[PDB]
Amino acid sequence: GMSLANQIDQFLGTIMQFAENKHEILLGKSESDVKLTSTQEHILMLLAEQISTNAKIAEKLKISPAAVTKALKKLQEQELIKSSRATNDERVVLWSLTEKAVPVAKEHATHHEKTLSTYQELGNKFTDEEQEVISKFLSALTEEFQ
Amino acid sequence: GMSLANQIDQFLGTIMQFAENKHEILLGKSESDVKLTSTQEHILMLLAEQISTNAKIAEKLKISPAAVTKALKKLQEQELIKSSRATNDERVVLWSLTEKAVPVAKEHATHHEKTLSTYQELGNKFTDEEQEVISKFLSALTEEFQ
Ligand SMILES: [Zn+2]
Ligand SMILES: [Zn+2]
User: Where does Zn(2+) 1 bind (chains A, B) (predicted)?
Assistant: First the structure.
């Protein structure tokens, strides 16, 4: 009392509320208009790190060529990325950020960093043995929502 | 590896996906069209148990008279509840289910029962000491989403 079952129920309620109208669960971020899909945001983060081919994007983000094609089309339309030709091979297209996209990618990277660091700091309050309990709990609970 | 931080991130992703387009996190329920708000569903559950006044509904569900008034209006329009006059006092209105609502309330009650029992069975796999760890974890994580 409160029972753990009820605590779990209430926790999931909290998460549902926070998640409403969002593409991703991210902390330290102000409410705003959803401009880009998560895949689009993640392509921009990848390109901030390395100019990349369609193939490399699919590989890194673990998504299909169709998904990559769709996201790139939208990003290019919004003038957030630009294509170029690989000097080694005339057939190979590379993608890079436009200046417009630089702060967009930086902002999204920051949101992920803040979110992960928040979870890390929380986890750091628990010993390995306790983290194992939490991990087993999360794994089991995850199975219920498949 | 996977780090607990990453496990938490992925877990919350799973929950976000499950929660999309839903009023409540409920298990053992098939996908369907959202006909009623959660408050409306909960009034029906309450009335299945006891014919009740507006005041009693607000008390039991811990919501305001305005919230109760709004939900009752919609339920009555859908012919899911009906008013009657308390025999003791001509001024006191009581609400009861219509036959139409009986299976609706039963179904929603079942969903809550299934959901809670699922969490209970999961919790039952952990000792009290382990449940305390989980509880502390959930409490702390909840604070991040306020
Ligand atoms: Zn993201
Ligand atoms: Zn409910």
Answer: 24, 41, 108, 112
